[PDB]
Amino acid sequence: TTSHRPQLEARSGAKAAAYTPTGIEHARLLPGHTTLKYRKFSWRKGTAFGRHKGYINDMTKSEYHQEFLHKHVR
Amino acid sequence: ERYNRLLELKAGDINPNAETQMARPDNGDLEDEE
Amino acid sequence: VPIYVKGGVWTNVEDQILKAAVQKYGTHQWSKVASLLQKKTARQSEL
Amino acid sequence: RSNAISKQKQYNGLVRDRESFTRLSKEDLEFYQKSKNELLKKEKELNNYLDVKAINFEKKKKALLME
RNA sequence: AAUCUCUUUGCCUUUUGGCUUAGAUCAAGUGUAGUAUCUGUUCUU
RNA sequence: GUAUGUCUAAAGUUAUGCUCUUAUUUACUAACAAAAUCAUUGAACUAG
């Protein structure tokens, strides 16, 4: 099917510039901030093991991401 | 297979390895199902 | 008549349909490929 | 009731029969076997070709080493 | 000096037009009907 | 069963081998269908 398309070019505002507009009043265009501001001017020896014997620019491999995965996947 | 040959089923059995076996030739009369 | 366990031996005809199907659907649509085969599942076609 | 049971038994039988392709028919086992036995024939033939000249290798070695 | 057809080179000339959780899941069914379809037999050729 | 789309057709007159007969196989489609074991009970009900 061809109805699913990438954009070849974006719609230009020049088209709307020629249209005759309507008088709808939008809530976001109501008066607000009407004034501008200006600047001035032995138990330890019986085991086989023991003492007796970083940022990188790649999210998917940063330690932060690894600990996130270890924390949320179990 | 090579390891075995380098160290030197049955009717009604399930073949566990069927996906790796050689293809059975099409005999000249194709069955209606095929 | 239903078929609950699929498999058996791969015939040549099945291999040829599988190859034609892969040429069309690629290698990530094994259910669509197996849908053309009567005796084989998606996982068996992928294998 | 006996009828309905017998017919469900027969249809179950048809299903059990229809799934027989999942097993190795004797014709599948024979088909692999020949490939094994004709592979062993190839191996025998090649090995015979190898050792039918490997024994005579010393006689030609002596002949070539003369000059 | 001017035609026609080959062959190579160039041109590709009806020569894959987005996105997400591969977007998701499913592929067991009776009667009758509808459409397409299959083997065979005579017939057409 | 929808969304939704299409149709509605005179008059209210504008001057000049390859097929066929036919018995099957297979697939798809059907808001078509009250189908006999497992004092009478699916029963008018389901849609993006």
Assign 3-class secondary structure to chain A: CCCCCCCCCCCCHHHHHHCCCCCCCCHHHCCCCCCCCCCCCCCCCCCCCCCCCCCCCCHHHCHHHHHHHHHHCC
Give the integer Cα–Cα distance in Å for B20 and B11: 19
Question: How far, in Å, are A4, A44, A48, A49, A50 from residue A53 at the CA level?
Answer: 69, 10, 8, 6, 6
Of A74, A55, A51, whose CA–CA distance to A65 is shortest?
A55
What three-state secondary structure class fits D2? helix
Residue B13: CB atoms within 10 A of its CB come to 11
> Is C11 in contact with B24 (CB distance < 8 Å)?
yes
Residues 6+ apart with CB under 8 A from D14: C1
User: Which nucleotides of strand E lie under 7 Å from a protein CB?
Assistant: 17-19, 22, 26-29, 38
Does the CB of C36 fall within 7 Å of any strand E atom? no
Q: Which residues of D43-61 are buried (b: 16+ CB within 10 A; e: fewer)?
A: eeeeeeeeeeeeeeeeeee
Measure the CA–CA gap between A52 and C36, rounded to whole angstroms.
67
The residue type found at A8 is: L
Return the ∠ at Cα A62 (arms to A60 and A64), rounded to 5°. 105
- Tell me whether residues D23 and B14 touch, CB distance under 8 A: yes
* Nearest CA distance, D30 vs chain C (angstrom): 13
Are the C-beta atoms of residues D38 and C21 closer than 8 Å to each other? no
**Tokens 């028919």 belong to which residue?**
D25
Strand locations in chain C (E): none
Q: In whole angstroms, what is the distance from residue D35 CA to residue B24 CA?
A: 11
Phi, psi dihedral angles at D4 (to 5 degrees):
-60, -35
Q: Cα(D54)–Cα(D48) distance, rounded to whole angstroms?
A: 10
Experimental method: cryo-EM
What are chain B's partners, defined as 3 or more CB pairs within 8 angstroms?
A: C, D
Residue with tokens 């099409």: B26
Which of helix, strand or coil describes residue D5? helix
From residue A49, alpha-carbon distances to A43, A45, A52, A53 in Å are 13, 9, 8, 6
